[PDB]
């Protein structure tokens, strides 16, 4: 069967036994092209302890094209669009076939630590991040609470 399906079972085996801290992911039972994921808000960031759910969608072009990924949880982060999609260069202009599910999620998670207000997907959020730090944190925390519920 397909290269994509083969690459994807590798990624799964990877996530099933040796998954990075604070992140997890798995296909649907009956459709390996679609995955639920979750990233936990890392410590000492305003996002701390949030449980942010994502959706990874693949097609047969994988791994020559990145998957489509978006948060299903309400987000407030300078590099996440309103529709949940993520402005991260390895998912757009700078993808290479060496990335897998594990490494995508850890690249995303690292945005929680060091956002990039230089490339804003959420302009409201980029703005607060530079000009109203206190207001920014309060918005993030609202997001944290909603992620539980």
């Amino acid at each position: 069967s397909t290269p994509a399906r083969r690459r994807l079972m590798r990624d799964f085996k990877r996530m099933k036994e040796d998954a990075p801290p604070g992140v997890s992911a798995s296909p649907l039972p009956d459709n390996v092209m679609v995955w639920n994921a979750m990233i936990i808000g890392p410590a000492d960031t305003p996002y701390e302890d949030g449980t942010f759910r994502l959706l990874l969608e693949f097609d047969e072009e994988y791994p020559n094209k990145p998957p489509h990924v978006k948060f299903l949880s309400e987000m407030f982060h300078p590099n996440v669009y309103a529709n949940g999609e993520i402005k991260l260069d390895i998912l757009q202009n700078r993808w290479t076939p060496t990335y897998d599910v594990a490494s995508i999620l850890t690249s995303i998670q690292s945005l929680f630590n060091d956002p990039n207000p230089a490339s804003p997907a959420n302009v409201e959020a980029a703005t607060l991040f530079k000009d109203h730090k206190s207001q920014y944190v309060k918005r993030v925390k609202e997001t944290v609470e909603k992620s539980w519920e």
């Binding site: 402005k87 490339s119 804003p120 302009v123 409201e124 703005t127």
Partner: protein, 78 residues
């Protein structure tokens, strides 16, 4: 119920728009895109110190007739 407003950049370049008090900041940013070719994601609109957020209306910010909004461009802004 309609009014003329102005939108001015930091360069001095100014356009005039006809709007209504109940148009949204999003609607206004689209008109600007059409009139100056700038994608709404690269626009920052300021009026009386407050930055204007989408899904609020002009009347909300008390933008009345003949008001001038300040447009700040952020490139690459993406």
């Amino acid at each position: 119920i309609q009014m003329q407003i102005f939108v001015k950049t930091l360069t001095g370049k100014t356009i005039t728009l006809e709007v209504e008090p109940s148009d949204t900041i999003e609607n206004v940013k689209a008109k600007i895109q059409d009139k100056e070719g700038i994608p709404p994601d690269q626009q920052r609109l300021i009026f009386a110190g407050k930055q204007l957020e989408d899904g609020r209306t002009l009347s909300d910010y008390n933008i009345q007739k003949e008001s001038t909004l300040h447009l700040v461009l952020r490139l690459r802004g993406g």
